[PDB]
Amino acid sequence: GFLAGKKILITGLLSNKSIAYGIAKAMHREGAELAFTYVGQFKDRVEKLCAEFNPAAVLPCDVISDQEIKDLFVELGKVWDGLDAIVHSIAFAPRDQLEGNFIDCVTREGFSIAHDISAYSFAALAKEGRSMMKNRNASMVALTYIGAEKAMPSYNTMGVAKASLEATVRYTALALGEDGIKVNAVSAGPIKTLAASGISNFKKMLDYNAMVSPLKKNVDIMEVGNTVAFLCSDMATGITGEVVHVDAGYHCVSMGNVL
Amino acid sequence: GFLAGKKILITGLLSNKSIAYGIAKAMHREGAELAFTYVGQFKDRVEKLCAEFNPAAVLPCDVISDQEIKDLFVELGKVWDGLDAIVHSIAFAPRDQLEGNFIDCVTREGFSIAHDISAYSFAALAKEGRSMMKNRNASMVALTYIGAEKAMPSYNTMGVAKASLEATVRYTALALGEDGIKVNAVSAGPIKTLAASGISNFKKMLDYNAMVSPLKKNVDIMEVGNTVAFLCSDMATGITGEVVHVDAGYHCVSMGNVL
Ligand SMILES: NC(=O)c1ccc[n+]([C@@H]2O[C@H](COP(=O)([O-])OP(=O)(O)OC[C@H]3O[C@@H](n4cnc5c(N)ncnc54)[C@H](O)[C@@H]3O)[C@@H](O)[C@H]2O)c1
Ligand SMILES: NC(=O)c1ccc[n+]([C@@H]2O[C@H](COP(=O)([O-])OP(=O)(O)OC[C@H]3O[C@@H](n4cnc5c(N)ncnc54)[C@H](O)[C@@H]3O)[C@@H](O)[C@H]2O)c1
Ligand SMILES: c1cc2c(cc1Cn1cnc3cc4c(cc31)CCCC4)OCO2
Ligand SMILES: c1cc2c(cc1Cn1cnc3cc4c(cc31)CCCC4)OCO2
Numbered sequence A, B: 001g002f003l004a005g006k007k008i009l010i011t012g013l014l015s016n017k018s019i020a021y022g023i024a025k026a027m028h029r030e031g032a033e034l035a036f037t038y039v040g041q042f043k044d045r046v047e048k049l050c051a052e053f054n055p056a057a058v059l060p061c062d063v064i065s066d067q068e069i070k071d072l073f074v075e076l077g078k079v080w081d082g083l084d085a086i087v088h089s090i091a092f093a094p095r096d097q098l099e100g101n102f103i104d105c106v107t108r109e110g111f112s113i114a115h116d117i118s119a120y121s122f123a124a125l126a127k128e129g130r131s132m133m134k135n136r137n138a139s140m141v142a143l144t145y146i147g148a149e150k151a152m153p154s155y156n157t158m159g160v161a162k163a164s165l166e167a168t169v170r171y172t173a174l175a176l177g178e179d180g181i182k183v184n185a186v187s188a189g190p191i192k193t194l195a196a197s198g199i200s201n202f203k204k205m206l207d208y209n210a211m212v213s214p215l216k217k218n219v220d221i222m223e224v225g226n227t228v229a230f231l232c233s234d235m236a237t238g239i240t241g242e243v244v245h246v247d248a249g250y251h252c253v254s255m256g257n258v259l
C-alpha cells in the first residue's frame, strides 16, 4: 500500500455515508494506521463504525474547544511518536444559515459559528499537531466545496466559510511548508451524507450535477477518499496549497446543452 | 500496482531528464503497459531510452502532421484492442518567441506554430484516439505551466499557447466525458530538461522557485510522474477538466519574505 506505516488522524467520521468513511476505507486499504475523533454524544456510534479499521485511538474532539484540541494531541502523542497526516472533514453552520436568501438569513452569530467550526478549526488542528508532524513529509487535507468560489442558492453562509477555509489552507501551507508539511484541499461534488439531511431538494442538486458534469455522474465517497489518500502519500510531495476538484468535472463547465 | 494492465501511450520522451521519463518510470512501477512516440530524427535515441520499460510499441509521431497522428492509432490498434490513456508531454515554439519583450518578439508565424504543436496537438490526439478509449474509464493528461495563468518574463508566446492548451483540456473534457474519458493537466514547476536548454538563467528561475515556494525545494520528474500516473488510475475517476499544480506550492503564494 502507498500509505504503509503512515499514522493518520481522521476527523469527521459520523456514519457509513460520511466522506470520512470513504477516506478511511481508502487509507486502510493502502496500509495506513488510523486514529479517529468524535464529538461528545457520538462516542459509541463512532467506535462501532471505525472498529473495522483497526484504529490506534478513538478520541473526543469538539473543535469549538481549544482545550479538547490540545488534549487530542496529548493523548495521541501517548500512542504515536510522530504524526504523518491530519484529515479535516468537519463543517457546521446553524440550520437557519442555510436556506433562502443569503442576506435575509445571514446573522452575525451564525456567520461566526460557521467560520469557527468550518475554517478556524483547520488552523487549530495545524497549530496543535505541528510538533508531531515536523520533518516527515507530513500532510494535511481539508474537505471543501465549490460554493467557496461561486455564489450558489442555499449554501449561503457555508459558502463564505468554505472560502475562509480555502484561504486558511493556503496560509497554513505557507506556514508549515518549512517543516516539510504539505497542505491541500479536496473540493467534492455533492454527496448524500448526513450533511445533506437538512437540505430540501438535495437530490435535485445531485441530479443537476450528473446532468451538467462532463462525466455524467455523481462522485462517491471512494472517489473522494482515494484522492485524499493520494494527497497524504510520498507521491504527492510536490503538491501543496492546492484545491483538487473531485466533482465529475462540474467545476470546469458553464451552462451546457440542457438549459 | 494501481495501473496494472492499463495500456498507456506516452509522448514527449526525449532524454532521461524528460518529464515523460519520470511519467514512464512511475507508470512502469505501477504495472502499466506502455507505448512511446518520437519525432523523426530521434528514433534510435528514444528506442534506447524506453527499452527498460518493455514498450509494446515505439512509433513515429510528429504532431505537425494529421497523417502521422492518424497512422499512430492505426499501428497502435494492431497491438492493442483498446487504449487506457494518452499522456501529452509535448511543447514547441521557435527560439525567437522565447526571450525578451513579448511584443517585440511575438510573430504571426511563431504564434501559430507554438499553438499548433503545444495546444492543437492535444485535441488532435484526442480526436484520433477517441474510438480506442471509449468506455473503459480512459484518461488523458497534458503537461502545462503557470505561464498560462500569469504574465512571466521570457515565457512569452509559450505562455499564451499553454493558456490555449488548458482551455483545450477543458473542452476536451467536456467533449469526451460521455465516453467515460477523463481529461486533466498537470502544471509542473520548472525542471532542468532539454526544454530548458535554450533559456539562459534557467537556473535562477529554479533558485527563485525554491526560495519562494512553501516547500522550499524544486519539484522533480518523479513528483510530476507520480501525479500523472495517479490521474490515469481508477482512483481519479471523479477528476476531469482539472489542473493540478505540482510545483512545491509556488502557485499559491504572492511576494514571500525575501523581496
Ligand atoms: N456532502 C456533500 O455534499 C459535500 C460536498 C463538498 C464538501 N463536503 C465537506 O465534507 C466534510 C465532511 O462532510 P460530510 O458530507 O461527510 O457530512 P457528515 O455530516 O458526515 O460530516 C461532517 C462532520 O463534521 C462534524 N462536526 C460538526 N461540528 C463539529 C465540531 N464542532 N467538532 C468536530 N466535528 C464536527 C460532524 O460530527 C460530522 O462528523 C465537510 O467539510 C463538508 O463541507 C461535503
Ligand atoms: N521543464 C520545465 O521547466 C517544465 C515546466 C512546466 C511544464 N513543462 C512541460 O512538459 C512537457 C514536456 O517537456 P520537458 O520539459 O520534459 O522537455 P523535453 O524537451 O524533454 O520534452 C518536450 C517534448 O516535446 C516534443 N516535441 C517537440 N515538437 C514536437 C512535435 N512536433 N511532435 C511531437 N513531439 C514534439 C519533443 O520532441 C520532446 O520530446 C511540455 O508540455 C512542457 O511545456 C516543463
Ligand atoms: C452541497 C451543496 C449545496 C448545499 C449543501 C451541500 C452539502 N454540504 C456541503 N458542505 C456542507 C457543509 C455543511 C452542511 C452541508 C454541506 C450542513 C450543515 C453543516 C455544514 O446547499 C446548497 O448547495
Ligand atoms: C519554464 C519557465 C520559463 C521559461 C521556460 C520554461 C521551461 N519550459 C516549460 N514549458 C516549456 C515549453 C517549451 C520550452 C520551454 C519550456 C522551449 C521551447 C519549446 C516549448 O521561459 C521563461 O520562464
Ligand code: NA
Binding pocket: A065, A066, A067, A068
Ligand atoms: Na475551552
